[PDB]
């Protein structure tokens, strides 16, 4: 084929040209940029919540959950990386160490620590199985990392939806390509045994008619679960009732890849879609689309509210960009020239990656620090300049 190959050549040329310009502009756009090459690409990233300060040094040690997807032959791993970060305070020699390498069955599609017990990590893995690990544990006989404490059997195809209930310890939700949502009750209670425990769902939802891409519990209401899907619906589930029926919203006309509930509000929810937009919703009046955030140039896949600032939201796309939105600029006037760059609330575009964004994660221990991964093995840890977000 003659158009495909030369179009891919031209795309790579564009990427290399724009990466060179991005590097030239970094000193004006960032307060920090740390880049680390990984041995394997990761589909997932999450900051763990611990921070270790060292008296007499100007940096702290923090940690990231990572995974692998050799997806053929090589053994996969749930990994924990330890990274130095500078200690900010108000007005490039930093290392990484892969400190834990835990054998994992198949690609690590998604991994999340339990908020109430961060040493417990759930993953979505081979064939649809979910797995539970205790990262403080060891092999029965050796110092090698432990086998899964539990395997969660229920999904019949692989999935990427995974989230813990921040208000009900050990409560887990998963969504997968079998179009099903499984609810689980994980009792770390039970990991006093010489063998991996097998766990079955406490509940299953067959309410979507296509791949379930993302699930999230409302940060402050333990019975409330949001789900989004390739069937182009956002669904709000009450986990007390019986599969009664959820609230269904035709939120976009193309696939919905991610969902994110504001951690500071009761009501504000955002969705990210293959239609290249992020949409905002008020849970008290969920059938009215409040606003549509424009700026990405391809499908939007990642979405996470800032854990420190109520109006700050971030998204990521196969356009290779991570965008940061500031909802306080809703309504501000802009010229049609500026509008070509995006909606008024678009605050910052991170252009440091040179392939599709896999996932990113806000650093809970520092303000305005993001860790992001792309498919070409690159991890970047970065902070936009206080010139841009300050005041």
């Amino acid at each position: 084929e003659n158009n495909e190959l030369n179009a891919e050549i031209d795309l790579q040329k564009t990427i290399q040209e724009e990466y060179k310009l991005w590097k030239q502009n970094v000193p004006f756009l960032y307060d920090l940029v740390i880049t680390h090459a990984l041995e394997w690409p990761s589909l997932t990233i999450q900051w763990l919540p611990d921070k270790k300060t060292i008296p007499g040094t100007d940096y702290s040690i923090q940690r990231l959950i990572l995974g692998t997807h050799t997806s053929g032959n090589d053994q996969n791993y749930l990994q924990i990386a330890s990274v130095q970060l500078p200690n900010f305070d108000e007005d490039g020699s930093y290392t990484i160490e892969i400190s834990q390498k835990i054998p994992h069955d198949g690609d690590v599609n998604r991994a999340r620590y339990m908020p109430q017990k961060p040493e417990i990590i759930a993953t979505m893995g081979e064939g649809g199985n979910a797995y539970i690990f205790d990262t403080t544990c060891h092999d029965a006989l050796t110092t090698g990392e432990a086998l899964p404490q539990a395997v969660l059997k229920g999904h019949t195809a692989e999935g990427f939806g995974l989230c813990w209930n921040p208000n009900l310890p050990g409560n887990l939700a998963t969504g997968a390509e079998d179009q099903v949502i499984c609810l689980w009750d994980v009792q770390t209670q039970s990991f006093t045994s010489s063998e991996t425990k097998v766990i079955s769902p406490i509940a299953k939802y067959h309410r979507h008619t296509d791949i379930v891409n993302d699930v999230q519990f409302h940060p402050q209401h333990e019975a409330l679960l949001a789900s989004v899907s390739d069937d182009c619906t956002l669904q709000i589930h009450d986990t007390r009732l019986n599969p009664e029926a959820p609230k269904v919203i035709q939120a976009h006309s193309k696939a919905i890849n991610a969902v994110a509930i504001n951690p500071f509000n009761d009501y504000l929810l955002a969705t990210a879609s293959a239609d290249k937009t992020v949409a905002l919703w008020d849970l008290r009046n969920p059938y009215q689309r409040l606003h549509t955030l424009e700026g990405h140039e391809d499908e939007v896949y990642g979405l996470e509210w800032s854990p420190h600032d109520e109006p700050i939201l971030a998204s990521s796309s196969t356009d290779r960009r991570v965008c940061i939105w500031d909802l306080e600029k809703i309504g501000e006037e802009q010229t049609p020239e500026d509008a070509e760059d995006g909606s008024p609330e678009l605050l910052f575009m991170h252009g440091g990656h040179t392939n599709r964004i896999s996932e990113f994660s806000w650093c809970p221990n520092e303000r305005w620090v993001v860790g992001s991964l792309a498919d070409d093995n690159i991890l970047q840890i970065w902070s936009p300049s206080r010139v841009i977000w300050g005041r």
Binding site: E18, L21, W22, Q24, N25, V26, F28, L29, G295, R321, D338, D341, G342, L346, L347, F348, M349, H350, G351, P384, S385, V387, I388
Partner: peptide, 15 residues
């Protein structure tokens, strides 16, 4: 180039 130039640069990603 003060704050407003930097803010268009930021929205464009410096690219």
């Amino acid at each position: 180039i003060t704050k407003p130039a930097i803010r268009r640069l930021a929205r464009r990603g410096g690219v």
